[PDB]
Amino acid sequence: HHHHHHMVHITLDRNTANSWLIISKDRRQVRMGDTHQNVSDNKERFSNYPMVLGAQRFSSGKMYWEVDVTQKEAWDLGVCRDSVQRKGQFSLSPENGFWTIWLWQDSYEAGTSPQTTLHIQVPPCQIGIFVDYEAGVVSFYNITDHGSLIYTFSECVFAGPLRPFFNVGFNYSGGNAAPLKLCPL
Ligand SMILES: NC(=S)Nc1ccccc1OC(F)(F)F
């Protein structure tokens, strides 16, 4: 791909974070803490899952960013509507306002309903995310494998402003403590 030149500087929005997340000073890294992180509750926080949004809102144009997933066992990445549900149980689907991929139990899947199996030969350590608002496209790239395509959502019906979306995953196994990191341009 030649999407790198639409690079945007993403930062994480603390106010949206699940109360167990720890976001770095520079707002570019996030990990699962081993307890509640001593913050007040608010209507923006994701309650049920270790999720957080980017601060940036996109309603036009082309945007690109990269995320480091090194030595994680589980995570979700992509974009979502600004108005997605925060409280309770929900599935990651375009019907619910999410355009995402994930790693879970040694398989990669796109968050369609029902989910779609991904075919990745080189497990990625960094993922590129490209959004073309006007075209209705969200694409994912394997930066570890020379930028190879992972998945494209097309004919997207965004129906609102978009925010970068992250899930660091639970750490029941003790093998998923590593952070998500926004990579430098
Ligand atoms: N709120 C729920 S249902 N679970 C949850 C979410 C975020 C951090 C911790 C959580 O409970 C757990 F520790 F049991 F997983």
From Swiss-Prot:
<feature type="domain" description="B30.2/SPRY">
    <location>
        <begin position="8"/>
        <end position="185"/>
    </location>
</feature>
<comment type="subunit">
    <text>Homotrimer. Component of a SCF(SKP2)-like complex containing CUL1, SKP1, TRIM21 and SKP2. Interacts with CALR, CUL1, FBXW11, HSPA5, IKBKB, IRF3, SKP1 and VCP. Interacts with SKP2; the interaction with SKP2 does not depend on an intact F-box domain. Interacts (via N-terminus and C-terminus) with DCP2 (via N-terminus and C-terminus). Interacts (via C-terminus) with IRF8 (via C-terminus). Interacts with ULK1, BECN1 and with ATG8 family members, including GABARAP, GABARAPL1, GABARAPL2 and MAP1LC3C/LC3C. Interacts with TRIM21 and SQSTM1/sequestosome 1. Interacts with IRF3.</text>
</comment>
<protein>
    <recommendedName>
        <fullName>E3 ubiquitin-protein ligase TRIM21</fullName>
    </recommendedName>
</protein>
<comment type="similarity">
    <text>Belongs to the TRIM/RBCC family.</text>
</comment>
<comment type="function">
    <text>E3 ubiquitin-protein ligase whose activity is dependent on E2 enzymes, UBE2D1, UBE2D2, UBE2E1 and UBE2E2. Forms a ubiquitin ligase complex in cooperation with the E2 UBE2D2 that is used not only for the ubiquitination of USP4 and IKBKB but also for its self-ubiquitination. Component of cullin-RING-based SCF (SKP1-CUL1-F-box protein) E3 ubiquitin-protein ligase complexes such as SCF(SKP2)-like complexes. A TRIM21-containing SCF(SKP2)-like complex is shown to mediate ubiquitination of CDKN1B ('Thr-187' phosphorylated-form), thereby promoting its degradation by the proteasome.</text>
</comment>
